[PDB]
Design a protein around this ligand. Sequence first.
Ligand code: IET
Ligand code: MG
Lengths: 552, 427
Amino acid sequence: PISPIETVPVKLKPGMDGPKVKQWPLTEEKIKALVEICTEMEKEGKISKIGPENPYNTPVFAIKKKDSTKWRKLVDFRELNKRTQDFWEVQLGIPHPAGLKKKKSVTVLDVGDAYFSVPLDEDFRKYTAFTIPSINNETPGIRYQYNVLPQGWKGSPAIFQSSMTKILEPFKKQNPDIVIYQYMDDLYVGSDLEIGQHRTKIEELRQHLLRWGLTTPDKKHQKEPPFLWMGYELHPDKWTVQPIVLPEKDSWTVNDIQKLVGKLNWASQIYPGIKVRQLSKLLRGTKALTEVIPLTEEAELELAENREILKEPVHGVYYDPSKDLIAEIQKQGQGQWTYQIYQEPFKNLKTGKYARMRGAHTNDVKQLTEAVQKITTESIVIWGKTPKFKLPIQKETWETWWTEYWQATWIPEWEFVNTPPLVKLWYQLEKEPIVGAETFYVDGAANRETKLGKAGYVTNKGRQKVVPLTNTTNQKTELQAIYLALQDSGLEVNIVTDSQYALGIIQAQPDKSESELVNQIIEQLIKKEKVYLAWVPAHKGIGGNEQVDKLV
Amino acid sequence: PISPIETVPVKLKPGMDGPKVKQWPLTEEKIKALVEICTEMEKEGKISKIGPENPYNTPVFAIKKKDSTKWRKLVDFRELNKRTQDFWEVQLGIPHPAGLKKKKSVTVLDVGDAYFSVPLDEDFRKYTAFTIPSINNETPGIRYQYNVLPQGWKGSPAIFQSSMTKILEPFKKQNPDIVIYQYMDDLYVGSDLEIGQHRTKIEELRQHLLRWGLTTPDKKHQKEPPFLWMGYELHPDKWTVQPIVLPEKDSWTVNDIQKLVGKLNWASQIYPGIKVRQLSKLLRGTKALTEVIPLTEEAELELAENREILKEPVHGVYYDPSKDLIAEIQKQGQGQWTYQIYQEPFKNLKTGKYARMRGAHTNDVKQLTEAVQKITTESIVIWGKTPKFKLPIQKETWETWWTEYWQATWIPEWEFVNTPPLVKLWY
Ligand SMILES: N#Cc1ccc(NC(=S)NC(=N)Cc2c(Cl)cccc2Cl)cc1
Ligand SMILES: [Mg+2]
């Protein structure tokens, strides 16, 4: 029954008073079906009768969707919860298993209908008033008020788990070795004392709990390693995800391609190298809940490899507080980078992927960091410390970039790994102009409307050229020019662009891009011996850039 | 402590609800720290534990003020502030001496310790609720609410005002000319004395607050110098301008001129009085990049006069207490980090720069974290209020490290920006 427990004082949102909703005089069958339920409740102390003087009312329902033994009364609190102060959302933070610690004997007790014994502020009970009717205008209605935590109320999962935690505290300070955790209706208790030695404590736990009204049945209870929690499969030493099945069709619609892509990330927690770029590059569209989205060529190949992977099941090891964490990043190539966190080489703690979903131009070194980063942040959350990295890159390749990269980054210590692909600056531009090297006064304007442009140059050597372009933006040409110059020039060249766009790009030294031209202007940089780029503002800077700006 | 006070009623702005900012995840080093610090405060009745009826929640980190003597709690009340201290920026608003930025020297000692005596208004507590995380959230955070004006919260000071000015009078007498700015947790004493003398005024002051109630851990060293004996002494005299170095080496090429025509053509917003056409006419031809060119007519002069308006600071630049102070810092080169503190683009207020050591901790995310705490104080001191920084750093990287080298009792506001382009080579 109820408890001696201290009652958390609750208040309804400012000004707002209690709900006053009515019951739609329903099946007089169900009626006496609540009248019996209610009466077993008022006796258990769970509720009480009250002089209709100043109460409100919430809709009272009786049901049993089911195909079983009895009926359940279900009070709809919607319009009460719309008036109750907010509480401290604590399930807001979920413990990720990959940072849990081995544990011998784990048990879980069913508390589900325990909140029914946790008192309810003896002053916020008037608002739990509900009216169970009578045969038909037979009685004003059998009228009760809730004395504990209504099964719907907003402040319940909260106030309960508060109250709970409190209750357990002492029991948790006289067994500082064992550990208790809760989950809505699931209290799990895991420890080290051999299941037997474990049983006693759980019974003592149960005995402690009963010493406070909180009751706890053992029948049709739970202990079922694997434990299905938060969409995980929890064993006393290993851990993994819910059964992940990848539906297969010949017709795909966002509604399914999403459930597909998402479900594909969730598996990444422990499944090595899972990719998702190509597959969700499709759902990369407008709000079509049922638009017929036809898998493209990559989507297929990719979904394929996620199977080859997802097929073979995988396990997850736990964290040993006494052993430094390690983490390695692998580059899958398409801005897709996969990692995995270990303490011991032939089993994992957790694995992961990181892809540069960002804008239009990036870098394998830059990305390697973002990944190095994405990871660090995760560790701190899970394990409470940063991991020792092992990354596909050389101190010399790194230190160069950060030393020449306007943004300020910081990578914890890191041990090199020759595991190709090898992250490395595919090229560098001259800091100073090459002496003697032909200068290409370059440019290429386009018509915003005519979507027609020109891109050429003019060298000191007096060499000119102006290739025509149809179906082009302006930035498209300001890069054609460049590529164009690079194209008709010696292993050594000095390029002059009026295009800060083209420059701000090139200067970042992208090793790849989402553009058909920036990936070409790239492989021409990769080939040159000495390349120095220069910036002269368009108009005003019509210095040498003059002759170049005229032709086009 | 042991002698109750008439708490000062505190009203959050109408329509404004307490803060509900989420607790950044900490190292376990940082938890154990705070976990201890708190239990302590709890015994002292300083602050207590709450329940689920308090849904409010403000951030808490842990850093080291001394060196590593031992940890210190630092609640990021940056929020409860906007929702309080902003309206408690006047109700009990502490004024700012626009001369402090001039003393021969400004020592800086804190008092955050003082507040910890004045009981906090029973009704307001709930909003100062702060919560110690756990590693992996394997447990419900420990929840605490303050029962005294906590520290970082910009209203503990305003409430304590009265009391300070009272402890600080029997010293304002003695030493007139000394200026005392109390901004949040720390006092800013500034005097035009030969170091040693001022230094005395300070110690002479500290000893004052001290024999009255306040305590200042300001014991900087302890009769011992091994090449590191720092007690916050700023020198708002050298707070100065002009390092926009136009090359000079009398041998300019098509390339050397090129870059120039640009940086000059850049400052056309911050300085609309600079021409370049005549020097850009020098480029007018499509000559090689490593060829030398010749000084022309007005150009040769244009380099003079356009290097001249480049000495007379931009006029129109007046602090606007209405608007906010923005400060963008930019990675310059090894060790050096140029910066600016404007209120409206291209109307810069102060444009210093900075540097740190290579071997010894050669790190960006450290320098920056200092170039902030420094850039900041220029402000607290100059305009009496921390800026908002356009930090050239990945939101998440910074998110992770700052706490480290972070010495200060305050957290400014900040944001992270994509790429300074043609600005690292200028200022
Ligand atoms: N099955 C299982 C299982 C696996 C790992 C752990 N290890 C730890 S350190 N977790 C706990 N202390 C408690 C715990 C959590 Cl976090 C989640 C569900 C149940 C329990 Cl009991 C506990 C139980
Ligand atoms: Mg042009």
